[PDB]
Design a protein around this nucleic acid. Structure first.
Lengths: 97, 93, 108, 79, 93, 106, 79, 97
DNA sequence: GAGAATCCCGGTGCCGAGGCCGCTCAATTGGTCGTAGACAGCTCTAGCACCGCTTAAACGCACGTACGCGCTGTCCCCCGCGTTTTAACCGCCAAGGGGATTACTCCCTAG
DNA sequence: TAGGGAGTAATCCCCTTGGCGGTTAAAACGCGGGGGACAGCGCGTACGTGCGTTTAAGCGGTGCTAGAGCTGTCTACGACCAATTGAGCGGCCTCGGCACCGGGATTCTC
C-alpha cells in the first residue's frame, strides 16, 4: 500500500487540533482528581460544574503556554525532541520554582 | 434583580453591524471585560487621587489614568472620544 | 420640566447615572466630581465599540451571523494593542493561533 | 489511579495544542507533577474563599477570584 | 511633619538584640517593607469585604487575607500571635 | 492608657487605626482589627529583625547594613517567596557558581 | 556620542557580577539595546505622574510609585 | 614571563564583585542619558539627585535579573559563551515583549 | 619549586549614629443614636448517587527508521596585557527658580 | 439646603542647575596565543505507526435531600462630637564603628 512520512500526518493532526476548540481532557477523571485534591484541605466539600470547568480551562491554558515555551526552549537547543531539562529551564526562567 | 450591560452592548453592535447575532457566553465575556477595565481605571484614579493629597476625583484624574493604563494609540483615541463627549455634555447653556 | 438623561446629553448609549452610582458606592473616593462618569462612560463605550468592530469583521471572515468566542479570541490576538492589554487574561473557549516555527517544516 | 487519571494521549493533546513535534516518554509524570503543583496553589485559595463564605460547596465565583489572585484571570464566569 | 515608625522597630530590635545597631537606609528599607505589606493586606481586606457584601472590616477578613497572602509557617504563626493579642485585648476590655 | 500596652504590643494601634479609617476602604471598621494588624506587623518586624541580627552577628559587624538585610531576605525560602518582587538598594546578590563554569577536575 | 554614555568596562562590570567566565564581544551592543527601552518604560510612567502634580521636577517619591505601578516596588528612598 | 590561563582572573574578579555591592555604572553619563531621553516629552526638566540613584539601582537590578537568566540559558545551550539568541530567549521566556 | 594575590593584624580622624529636652498636635475617654451583622426560620434549586447501553478511545505488543548523541578537526575571536588619553570626580562658589505654606472665597458636591 | 475643598496668590528659602580646575582612576587601542564553537560523519534506539483487545467515558434518566437563598426582626457594635493630656517629631549635642591605610602571613597557579 501507500504510507506517509513520519512527521507529515503529525502536521495534519497538529493543524486539526489547533483549528479545533474542543476540550482535550476527560471530565470524570478530572473531577475525581479535583475532588481527591480538595479532600486534603477540607472534608465534606461539594462542587459546582462551572467551577470544575473554570479550573479545567485554566489548567489546559497554562499547560498549552508551558508546552509552547518548552517547544521554543527545545528548538533553541538545536533539537526537535523536547526533554525534561527544557521543562525545568522554562519553569526556572518563567519564575515558578 | 441582577444587572447586566446587555442592552447597551446590543445597541453598540447594532450601529456597526445590524445583521449580527450574539452568544450569551460572548455577552458574559464582554461584561467581564468592561467590568475589568472599569475596576482597573477606578483603582488607578483612586490611587492617583490619594497620591496627590486630594479628596476629589475629577475628569483630569481619569484622564491621567487612561494615559497610564491604555497603550498610546488607543490612549489618544480614548481621550479624544472622552473630550468630545465631555465638552458636548458641558455645553448645557 | 421633564428632561432626558445625561447619556444622550453627552450623546452616549451607555448609562451615565449607573456609572456614577457604581463610582459613588464603589468606595474609591469620598467626593466624586461631575464630569468623571461622563468621561468614563465615553471611554468604555469607545472600547466596547472597537472590540465589537473587531469581532464583527472576524465573524464576517468566517461567513457567519453570530459571535462565537473563537471570533473574540482571534480579534483579540491578531491586534497588537489588545494583545498588550489582554496578555494575562484567558478567554473561555478560545484556543490558540495556527503557528509553526520555520525549521520544523519539511524544508528538504 | 487519581494522579495518573489523566491518560497518556491527553498530555499529547495538550502538547500538539502547544505546537510541539516530538514528545519524550519521561515528560508525562513530570507534567502530572507540574499540574498537581499548580492545582495545589489554586484550590487552596479557592477553599479558603469557600470556608470564609460559611459554605461547604465551591461554586462559580470563588474560583474565578482565586485565579484572579495570581494574575491568571479568566473571563466569562465572573458573574 | 511626616510620621515614622522608628521608635517601635528600635524597641523591637533592642528587645531581640541588645547590641546590634541599624542604619538610616536600613530604617527606610524596613519602613517601606512595613508600608508595603500594610497596603497589600489592607487592599485585600477591602476587596474581600466587598466580595462578601459587608460594610464592616473586622479581624475575620484579615485572618482570611493572611491565610491566603502569606506563606504557610508565617501564616499560622501570625494567626496564633494575632489571636493571642485578640484574646488578650478582649479579656482586658 | 495606651491600647498597645493593653494589647501587650509595641506598635501604635491608634496610628494604624487612623490610617485604616482615613484611607477609603470600608464604611465601617472594627476595633480589634487594628489591634490584630498591629500584632502581625510586630511579629513580622520581629522576625525580619531577628534574621538580620543573626546575619549581622555572623559577619563580625554590629551594624545593620542593607547587604545583611538582603542576605537575611534571600537565605529564607519563605521570605524569598514573599518578597521576590522587590529590590533592596545596595543589597547585592547571593554568591553562586555553576559546576560547569567551575574549571579543572577534582 | 551621548548615547555612548554607558561604557564597555561597565558592561563587563555587570557581566562579572552575574558570574560568567566568557563574555562575547557582541553582548555589549545587545545590552545597550535592552537598556534604552526599559528605563524608557519608567519615563513613560514617571514624568506624566509628575505632569499630574503641576510639577516640573521629578523626585524620589514618584519614581518608586511608578515602579510599584510597573511591579518592582523598591525600598530605600521612601514611598 | 608569568601568563595566566584565560578565565581564572575572570572567576577571581567575579568572586570579588560577588563580595562587592557598590554601583557599577558611572553617574554623570547616566545623568546625561536620562536627560537626553527625558527632553523628548517636555523641555526644561529639573531633576532631583535621589531619583537618578533610584534609576541606577533599578537598571543594575534589572541587568542582574536578566543576566542570570541568560547565563542559565547559555549553560543549558551546552556552551560557555553567551549570544544574541540567549538574550531574546531569556526575554521570551520571561515574558517581556 | 616561585609569584601575584590575597586574608589578616594593628594605628587614624570622622562623621554620621545614639541621647535630650521643648513641645505641639493626635490618641484617649465619654456620651448618644441609628443602623447593619447575627440569628432564626423559611422555600425550592441543584448536587450527589446509581443503572444500564453504546462505543469511541485507550492499552499493549510489534518493528523501523530518522535523530540524539559520541567523536573530531579546525579557523578565530575573546582574553590578558602594555601604552596613551580622555573625561569623571571632588571642592567650591553663586543664583534664582521653583516647592511649601499661609489664608480667605465661593461653588458645587453631599444629603 | 450647607459647608468646606480646591483655588488662587504671594512669600520665603533651598537646592540644583552651570561653571570652574586639577588630577587620575580608567577607558581605548593594538597585540599574541589558545580553548570553543563550528560543521561533519557514524551508531543505535526511541518514538511513531498499526491492528487486536479491552473499558470505562458519555448520555440519559431517576431518586433523594443538603443547602443556597430570601425574609424578619433585633440590639449592640460603631459613627459622631467635645474635651483633654502626653508622646513622638525635631533641633541640637557628643563620641566610637567602620572604612582607610600600612605591612607581614598565606593560598592557588604556573
Amino acid at each position: 500500500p501507500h504510507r506517509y512520512k513520519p512527521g507529515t500526518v503529525a502536521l495534519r493532526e497538529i493543524r486539526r487540533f489547533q483549528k479545533s476548540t474542543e476540550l482535550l481532557i476527560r471530565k470524570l477523571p478530572f473531577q475525581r482528581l479535583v475532588r481527591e485534591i480538595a479532600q486534603d484541605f477540607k472534608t465534606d466539600l461539594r462542587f459546582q460544574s462551572s467551577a470544575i470547568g473554570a479550573l479545567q480551562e485554566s489548567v489546559e491554558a497554562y499547560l498549552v503556554s508551558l508546552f509552547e515555551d518548552t517547544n521554543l526552549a527545545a528548538i533553541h537547543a538545536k533539537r526537535v525532541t523536547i526533554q525534561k531539562k527544557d521543562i525545568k529551564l522554562a519553569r526556572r526562567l518563567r519564575g515558578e520554582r | 434583580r441582577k444587572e447586566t450591560y446587555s442592552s447597551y452592548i446590543y445597541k453598540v453592535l447594532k450601529q456597526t453591524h445590524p445583521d449580527t447575532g450574539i452568544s450569551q457566553k460572548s455577552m458574559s465575556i464582554l461584561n467581564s471585560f468592561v467590568n475589568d477595565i472599569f475596576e482597573r481605571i477606578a483603582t488607578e484614579a483612586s490611587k492617583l487621587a490619594a497620591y496627590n493629597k486630594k479628596s476629589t476625583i475629577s475628569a483630569r484624574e481619569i484622564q491621567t489614568a487612561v494615559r497610564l493604563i491604555l497603550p498610546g494609540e488607543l490612549a489618544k483615541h480614548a481621550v479624544s472620544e472622552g473630550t468630545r463627549a465631555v465638552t458636548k455634555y458641558s455645553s448645557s447653556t | 420640566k421633564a428632561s432626558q438623561s445625561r447619556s444622550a446629553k453627552a450623546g452616549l448609549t451607555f448609562p451615565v447615572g449607573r456609572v456614577h452610582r457604581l463610582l459613588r458606592r464603589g468606595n474609591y473616593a469620598q467626593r466624586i466630581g461631575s464630569g468623571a462618569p461622563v468621561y468614563l462612560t465615553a471611554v468604555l463605550e469607545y472600547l466596547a465599540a472597537e472590540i465589537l468592530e473587531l469581532a464583527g469583521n472576524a465573524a464576517r471572515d468566517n461567513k457567519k451571523t453570530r459571535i462565537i468566542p473563537r471570533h473574540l479570541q482571534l480579534a483579540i490576538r491578531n491586534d497588537d494593542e489588545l494583545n498588550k492589554l489582554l496578555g494575562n487574561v484567558t478567554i473561555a473557549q478560545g484556543g490558540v493561533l495556527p503557528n509553526i516555527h520555520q525549521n520544523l517544516l519539511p524544508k528538504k | 489511579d487519581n494522579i495518573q487519571g489523566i491518560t497518556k494521549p491527553a498530555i499529547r493533546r495538550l502538547a500538539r495544542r502547544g505546537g510541539v513535534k516530538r514528545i519524550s516518554g519521561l515528560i508525562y509524570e513530570e507534567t502530572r507533577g507540574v499540574l498537581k503543583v499548580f492545582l495545589e496553589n489554586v484550590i487552596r485559595d479557592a477553599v479558603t474563599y469557600t470556608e470564609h463564605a460559611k459554605r461547604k460547596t465551591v461554586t462559580a465565583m470563588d474560583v474565578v477570584y482565586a485565579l484572579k489572585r495570581q494574575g491568571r484571570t479568566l473571563y466569562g464566569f465572573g458573574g
